[PDB]
Design an enzyme around this catalytic site. Structure first.
Site, PDB file in Angstrom:
ATOM      1  N   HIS A 166       0.836  -1.209   0.000  1.00  0.00           N
ATOM      2  CA  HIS A 166       0.000   0.000   0.000  1.00  0.00           C
ATOM      3  C   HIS A 166       0.877   1.268   0.000  1.00  0.00           C
ATOM      4  CE1 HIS A 166      -2.495   3.136   1.805  1.00  0.00           C
ATOM      5  NE2 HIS A 166      -3.417   2.571   1.031  1.00  0.00           N
ATOM      6  N   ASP A 319      -7.109   5.283   4.545  1.00  0.00           N
ATOM      7  CA  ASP A 319      -7.117   5.224   3.093  1.00  0.00           C
ATOM      8  C   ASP A 319      -7.384   3.774   2.631  1.00  0.00           C
ATOM      9  OD1 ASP A 319      -5.534   6.802   0.402  1.00  0.00           O
ATOM     10  OD2 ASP A 319      -5.388   4.591   0.469  1.00  0.00           O
TER      11      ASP A 319
END
Ligand code: HEM
Ligand code: HEM
Ligand SMILES: C[C@H](CCC(=O)O)[C@H]1CC[C@H]2[C@@H]3[C@H](O)C[C@@H]4C[C@H](O)CC[C@]4(C)[C@H]3C[C@H](O)[C@]12C
Ligand SMILES: C[C@H](CCC(=O)O)[C@H]1CC[C@H]2[C@@H]3[C@H](O)C[C@@H]4C[C@H](O)CC[C@]4(C)[C@H]3C[C@H](O)[C@]12C
Ligand SMILES: C[C@H](CCC(=O)O)[C@H]1CC[C@H]2[C@@H]3[C@H](O)C[C@@H]4C[C@H](O)CC[C@]4(C)[C@H]3C[C@H](O)[C@]12C
Ligand SMILES: C[C@H](CCC(=O)O)[C@H]1CC[C@H]2[C@@H]3[C@H](O)C[C@@H]4C[C@H](O)CC[C@]4(C)[C@H]3C[C@H](O)[C@]12C
Ligand SMILES: C[C@H](CCC(=O)O)[C@H]1CC[C@H]2[C@@H]3[C@H](O)C[C@@H]4C[C@H](O)CC[C@]4(C)[C@H]3C[C@H](O)[C@]12C
Ligand code: FES
Ligand code: FES
Ligand SMILES: [Cl-]
Lengths: 359, 359
Positions: A166, A319
């Protein structure tokens, strides 16, 4: 008021003080998802009593316990504030902490999430890289809990089961590395070796096809890409005591070997467990670190700060929860595939639990 | 016109006919990079004779030899045509092939390179992922060639020593997997397990810190990310030799394992050797593939085509050579760091050979 979306933050936990060590270890050696021992119910309590003192001693060397609860809460609190703004349609978000081996236990957190009457629940592993021993045990707990309690979820479940590359996790690693490199002398900065160090798996767990070593490797390469390969690196593995083979190179032997071969400046990076944890022989034991500096002339061994200690880490967490919600997925594609040589019948149950969820 | 820039394409080679098997093997078991044995000069020619029929039999099962030479020269011819157009200022590029174990042997190509009086030479490994057993042995032969012949080089040397995530290498793998997925029934396509298969390394080599498993893992993640994780995957390790522990999961046991757990559709990917090579048990032996279809009911095991092959592979090669030239680097940063437990004195000699070149 009233929470509509629940975010279950899963992690093994850690004893908050040294008195907590016995019961942390008890629940660990009892975990069938972690390891299979003959007559497990009877061996565990014993192994747990025999190792409590060495492990209290180790936790004493690092401040007397693990900060994981307080750090997880504060990251949780920060992930919520960001989610409330980020995804207004999932509205009041609430984080729960589900530790595998210490209070608040995964089962305890599940009960509370039901009592809260949530609309959706998200099993959000805090291990970026998936192993059956870590993320898979925690997901297996969530299924072994409905199967123990004889009832069916009263909320809709989904899982964020891995996130090894990520972009904000990678940027946090690279930031913590840059910051730590700035503590070595400027003229030396070039020669510092970046040793990524992840906890090892036994070779029998590697050989059954655990996905972990490959995903740790992927996080490593992304980090180094983001750093534009400014220093040289290796991925090594913090093994341990017992004489079973584990995946190496071992962190302690690599440090010694590096120093024996002229590399005097070494930056350790905890690439696979985001909170403070037990450190290595050359970090802890002064006669070793002494022997080493005298034989090879070690100049500097430094460890980069834990992520779960940051801010912008919250931003990473929010996120992920937010892309997970946008995307409507139940689990990653990887979770649909059990290890080639898996011999644990619950693994497959836990997989269908997630892929079979309403919505 | 008259060559200024030489590109030495390095690889182990392979016996072009079953006639060549003995000598291929002889030079392989004599490689002190690669492996050390007692009485090596005496043991090798023996081991070579003992194993020759087994290995002739394996190459018979795949067409009677390796096509690496023809494929490598054709890729080389095509890299050269684009290099001439991409970088006019480095002029007449010319490609040489330097195989480690069969003619044109690496020393042979260095001699011819020296006689052609080139301006600059580029040791361009054809292994995208670095191991000291592959790329390192090839780089080591180059240094031990100048130390053999007691002379200094007559051209400027540089190295492309690894390229495990090069964007066009990644695009070729992805295209090859997509095309092979198209060969499974439409209804089953999303069930196909992608088994990346790379040659294994012995655990004692892994445990001394070989970079290879981490780099192969990085290539795998980049490919699945280009494919947007359309199928589930694992990275497994093939073609283990002898009875010492090697890095697993084994490709053969993983295929069997996966079928006994209901995965009937399997796409194998040669992720770490770009040319046709010996295949695995379940692809070759029919009494094994029979037992397997009778007991677990395997529907389709398929293998993606070698990068071979494709012409966008030549583009991958040219682009890398061209970035190398533009960048002015002598080697990757990773090459300046030896394995933590390296016990080969030549490794360090080979590093400083490359890092120390004029320009
Ligand atoms: C099947 C594989 C694994 C086994 C058998 C295992 C074994 C153990 C054992 C026995 C302990 C208790 C301490 C002791 O008695 O020495 C422990 C603690 C721990 N394990 Fe593992 N472990 C495995 C995998 C992992 C992985 C993949 C991770 C990280 C992502 C990890 C992280 C930890 C941490 C953080 C502790 C707490 C003590 C410390 O801070 O080092 N373990 N493990
Ligand atoms: C130190 C590690 C390695 C050892 C000790 C080793 C050992 C061997 C041996 C003994 C052979 C000859 C065939 C036989 O006698 O069975 C062979 C062939 C071969 N090795 Fe390795 N190997 C190693 C690593 C690798 C790696 C990293 C690659 C990477 C791509 C690789 C690719 C090959 C290939 C392509 C062949 C030709 C036969 C075939 O097509 O499989 N090897 N190896
Ligand atoms: C013997 C067996 C090895 C693998 C297995 O049997 O499953 C292992 C798994 C866990 C082992 C126990 C634990 O390893 C803890 C103990 C450590 C002792 O020094 C050896 C015996 C000891 C009491 C072990 C007995 C036996 O070796 C066990 C039960
Ligand atoms: C290190 C740990 C406890 C501390 C010790 O006794 O050394 C020991 C005791 C129980 C052991 C584990 C269990 O016996 C179950 C596993 C059996 C596999 O064959 C090896 C790994 C395996 C996961 C073991 C590795 C290692 O020796 C363990 C984890
Ligand atoms: C779902 C959507 C499909 C189209 C696309 O790939 O962009 C894409 C965009 C972002 C992608 C995700 C991100 O690449 C990050 C995640 C990587 C995990 O290992 C798998 C799921 C994972 C969450 C991805 C799955 C999925 O393919 C996503 C969500
Ligand atoms: C264990 C020992 C070397 C010690 C080591 O390097 O670890 C091994 C490495 C390769 C082995 C040899 C090769 O495998 C070839 C032979 C195989 C036969 O089955 C036994 C003898 C035989 C001639 C082996 C003797 C011995 O086991 C050797 C020499
Ligand atoms: C596969 C082959 C077996 C040949 C035979 O028995 O006929 C043997 C011969 C020499 C062996 C190698 C050498 O003994 C040197 C290494 C020693 C390590 O302990 C294992 C890997 C190691 C790199 C060996 C792997 C493998 O067993 C080899 C390559
Ligand atoms: S052990 Fe990995 S899926 Fe069960
Ligand atoms: S064996 Fe890896 S650098 Fe020498
Ligand atoms: Cl040069």
């Amino acid at each position: 008021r009233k929470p509509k979306t629940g975010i279950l933050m899963l992690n093994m936990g850690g004893p908050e003080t040294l008195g907590d060590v016995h019961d942390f270890l008890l629940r660990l050696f009892l975990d069938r998802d972690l390891m299979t021992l003959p007559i497990q119910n009877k061996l565990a309590p014993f192994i747990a009593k025999r190792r409590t003192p060495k492990i209290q001693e180790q936790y004493r060397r690092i401040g007397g316990g693990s900060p994981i609860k307080i750090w997880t809460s504060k990251q949780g609190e920060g992930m919520v504030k960001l989610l409330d703004e980020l995804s207004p349609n999932t509205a009041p978000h609430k984080y729960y902490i589900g530790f595998r081996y210490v209070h608040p236990l995964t089962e305890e957190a599940i009960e509370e999430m039901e009592r809260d009457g949530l609309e959706r629940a998200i099993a959000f592993t805090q291990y970026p890289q998936y192993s059956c021993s870590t993320t898979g045990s925690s997901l297996n707990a969530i299924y072994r809990y409905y199967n123990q309690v004889g009832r069916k979820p009263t909320m809709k479940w989904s899982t964020i089961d891995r996130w090894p590359t990520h972009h904000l996790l990678i940027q946090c690693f690279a930031d913590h590395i840059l910051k730590e490199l700035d503590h070595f002398p400027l003229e030396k900065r070039s020669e510092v070796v970046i040793l990524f160090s992840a906890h090892s798996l036994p070779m029998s767990v590697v050989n059954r096809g655990d996905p972990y070593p490959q995903e740790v490797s992927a996080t490593v390469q992304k980090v180094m890409e983001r750093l534009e390969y400014c220093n040289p690196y290796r991925l090594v593995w913090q093994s341990k005591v017992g004489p079973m083979p584990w995946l190496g190179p071992q962190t302690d032997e690599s440090i010694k070997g590096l120093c024996e071969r002229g590399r005097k400046n070494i930056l350790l990076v905890p690439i696979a467990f985001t909170s403070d944890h037990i450190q290595t022989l050359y970090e802890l034991d002064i006669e070793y670190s002494q022997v080493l500096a005298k034989e090879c002339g070690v100049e500097n061994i430094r460890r980069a700060e834990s992520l779960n200690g940051n801010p912008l880490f919250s931003k990473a967490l929010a996120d992920l929860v937010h892309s997970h919600i946008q995307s409507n997925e139940l689990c990653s594609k990887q979770l649909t595939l059990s290890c080639p040589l898996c011999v644990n019948p619950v693994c497959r149950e836990t997989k269908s639990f997630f892929t079979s969820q309403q919505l």
